[PDB]
Structures are given as C-alpha cells and as structure tokens.
Amino acid sequence: MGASKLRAVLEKLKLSRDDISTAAGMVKGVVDHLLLRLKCDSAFRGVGLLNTGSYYEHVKAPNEFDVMFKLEVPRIQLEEYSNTRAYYFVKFKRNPKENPLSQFLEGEILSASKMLSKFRKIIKEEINDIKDTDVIMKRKRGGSPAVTLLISEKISVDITLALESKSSWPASTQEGLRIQNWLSAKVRKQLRLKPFYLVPKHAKEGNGFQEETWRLSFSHIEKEILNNHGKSKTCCENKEEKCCRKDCLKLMKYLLEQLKERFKDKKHLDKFSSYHVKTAFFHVCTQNPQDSQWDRKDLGLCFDNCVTYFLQCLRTEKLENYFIPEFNLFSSNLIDKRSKEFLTKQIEYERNNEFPVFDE
Ligand SMILES: Nc1nc2c(ncn2[C@@H]2O[C@@H]3COP(=O)(O)O[C@@H]4[C@H](O)[C@@H](COP(=O)(O)O[C@@H]2[C@@H]3O)O[C@H]4n2cnc3c(N)ncnc32)c(=O)[nH]1
Ligand SMILES: [Zn+2]
C-alpha cells in the first residue's frame, strides 16, 4: 500500500478542533456535575475521574466519548476465579475497622452486581433533568459495566467504574508487558510500580455467569506506552525521528471499525473489539523494538506487517493479553472459528484490493 494513500486516509481522519471541543464542553460539564454528586454517598466518596484525557477510542465515530471512574480500595485480596488468570474476587484484608463498601459485601466477597447497581442507580437519579442539557440513559446491554448516556440525542458517553489497587500487580502479570528490549526494563520496573485497576465483568462458565468477578484493567499503562512509544526518548520530537506507530494503530482500528460498520446486520464481527487490535499492535511493537523498523516512509510495509500479524492470530486462534500472557483473547471459548474465518476473509480481501473499505 502506498504511504501517501494511507496517509491520505489518516489525513481525512483528522477532524477540526471545534467538532472535538464543542461536544467535550457539554460532556465535561455532565461528568463534572456527576462527580460532585458521587461524593454524597460514603461508598462512592473515594471516587475520581481517571485522567485519561477524557477522550474517546473511536476515530471516525467522534460523537461518542468514554470516561472511567477510579475508586481506591485499600488492602484488597484478589481470588483467581476458575484459573481464568484475569478474573478475580475482592476480599478486604482487615474488616474490624468500618468499611465504606460493606453494603456491597456478599460475605467476604465483594459483589460487583450490587456495586454497579448502586452506581447506575445514582447516575440514573441524576440524569432526571437536573442540568440544562437533555440527557437520557440507555438500556443495560448485559454484562457491560459501562453506563451510557445520550446528550442532545447526538452524543453518547460511557461511564465505567474501576477499583484502584496501589498494591503489587498479580502473579498472572509476571511474564506480561514484555517491553524489556523495547522500552527498557527500567521503564517496565517503574511502570509495574503503579496501581492496577479492576472492572466489574463476569467471565464465562458455560450455561451461566458469576456477576461477582472483576477483571484486571491496565488502560493507564496502555495510554502511557502509547504516548511514549519510541525506544528513543526524543522519538517523534524531530523530523529525523518521526515514526509511524500511532499511524499504524489508527489504521488498524479504523479498518476494524469500517468492517464492523459494513457488516452491522450480521453478528460475525460483534465479538471483535478495537482492544484486540491494540493488543496485536503492542505485540508487533514487541516484535519490532527498533524505531528504524517504524520509519514513516515505511508506513505501507509496517502497517502490512501489523495486518499480517493480526491475521495470524485469527488464523491460529491465539491472541494473548499483553499483560496477562496466559489469558487468550481469541480462544474458541470466547470467539468461534466461524467469526475469525469471516474476519480473515474480509481483511485478506481488503489487503488484496488496496483497501477499498477506507473509501467508504
Ligand atoms: N463502552 C464500553 N463497552 C465495553 C467495555 N468492555 C466491554 N464492553 C462491551 O460490553 C460487553 C462485554 O463483553 P466482554 O467484556 O465479555 O468481551 C469483549 C467483547 O468480546 C469484545 C468487545 O465487544 P463490544 O462490542 O465493544 O461490546 C462489549 C460487550 O458487548 O472485546 C472484549 N473486550 C473489550 N474490551 C476488552 C479488554 N479491555 N480486555 C479484554 N477484553 C475486552 C468498555 O470498557 N467500555
Ligand atoms: Zn514515535
């Protein structure tokens, strides 16, 4: 693929500051309004907007946003559920002292369902026109911890609750984050000396669910390594060190989004998220630690590489969580072979025909 073609697509993706600010004002207003009322309850007293920039993950739909609320939970003990390596139960260490979240305690185990119930409840109470904006709450999609709300029948904002743990990272993440040769073991060291988050998501057990398990979240680390991607510290700070990592990620994400949009009727792509793309991209970054391997004039090649790798995952049904190596994202239990074969077919067609889906 021509670097000028792909860079033409990326040039098109770049939107004006007005379209990204006009909405961000109202969204920021609603969020800042909710944050105040969240502190009225003793449970959500230690809550706070996790500084991620208050931006979205989509590229072109920018009408949607994504915010994440962190909540510090001191002295927590995780319990690995059914050896899923990624889902845990929350058991507080010392309970003779009064605990704010005791109302959600299902014994020794913290109930995620009641937590999200109270959270979504308070939010649903504040959404009853208290502001000057017209905001309505969307239905629960099922299993989804996010609480989406709609402003002016145009802007969608998903609110997610997290559990901040300043303790040491779980043992499942021991062999994770293989950035030693890429961003140095020093950066890995200092990064692993950061808190890890927890999101209320139930894992699959077959003909049922738990609704009381929590998944490991490392979105902040992803943002960090994303905004600081080069092996060189001055990467993308001068004309001689401009790379194309971010460009590749944007291209992959946009490809997946366009394919998911084109086949919205069918359900073959509904089990694929941009996170699989991001993960695959991180794996490629590990496989290509040198900035020279990411020259901006090689955008075509680099991108192709990513595509190839992604395809390989789909072809092998293997996509390890970048932080939890044993946790496979493309396992047969999660996503079926049919969907992955479909996506391989579509993507392969796109690559073989100069990506006509970009011009849609
Ligand atoms: N707005 C919003 N929606 C989410 C989020 N995480 C999941 N969802 C959606 O809620 C359902 C939960 O599905 P699973 O978590 O069990 O696995 C989902 C699902 O298989 C796919 C996401 O598909 P989506 O269309 O975006 O909808 C999901 C899904 O309907 O990737 C998985 N996934 C998404 N984010 C991650 C992630 N960060 N780590 C591991 N797996 C992830 C989220 O963080 N924000
Ligand atoms: Zn760079």
Residue numbers in the entry: 160 to 219, 222 to 521
Publication text:
Cyclic GMP‐AMP synthase (cGAS)* is a sensor of cytosolic double‐stranded DNA (ds‐DNA). ds‐DNA in the cytosol may occur from infection or mitochondrial damage. cGAS is activated by ds‐DNA binding to catalyze the cyclization of ATP and GTP to form a cyclic dinucleotide with mixed 2′,5′‐ and 3′,5′‐phosphodiester linkage (2′,3′‐cGAMP), which in turn activates stimulator of type 1 interferon genes (STING). Activated STING causes the activation of TBK1, which phosphorylates IRF3 allowing it to translocate to the nucleus where it triggers interferon‐inducible gene activation and interferon production. We report here the structure of cGAS with dinucleotides and small molecule inhibitors, and kinetic studies of the cGAS mechanism.
To study the β‐pseudo‐active form we obtained structures of an N‐terminal truncation of cGAS starting at residue 161 (cGAS161)22 in complex with five cyclic dinucleotides (2′,2′‐cGAMP, 2′,3′‐cGAMP, 3′,3′‐cGAMP, 3′,3′‐cdIMP and 3′,3′‐cdUMP), and the linear 2′,5′‐GpAp dinucleotide. There is no interaction between Asp227 and 3′,3′‐cdUMP or 2′,2′‐cGAMP; in these structures cGAS retains an inactive pose. 2′,2′‐cGAMP contains an amino group on its guanine base; however, 2′,2′‐cGAMP is considerably displaced from the active site compared with 2′,3′‐cGAMP or 3′,3′‐cGAMP with its amino group interacting with Asp319 (2.9 Å) instead of Asp227. Each compound binds to the same site formed between the side chains of Tyr436 and Arg376. This site is occupied by the adenine base in structures of ATP, 2′,2′‐cGAMP, 2′,3′‐cGAMP, or 3′,3′‐cGAMP, and is composed primarily of London dispersion interactions between the ring system of these binders with the phenyl ring of Try436. Most of these dinucleotides have affinities weaker than 500 μM (the top concentration tested).
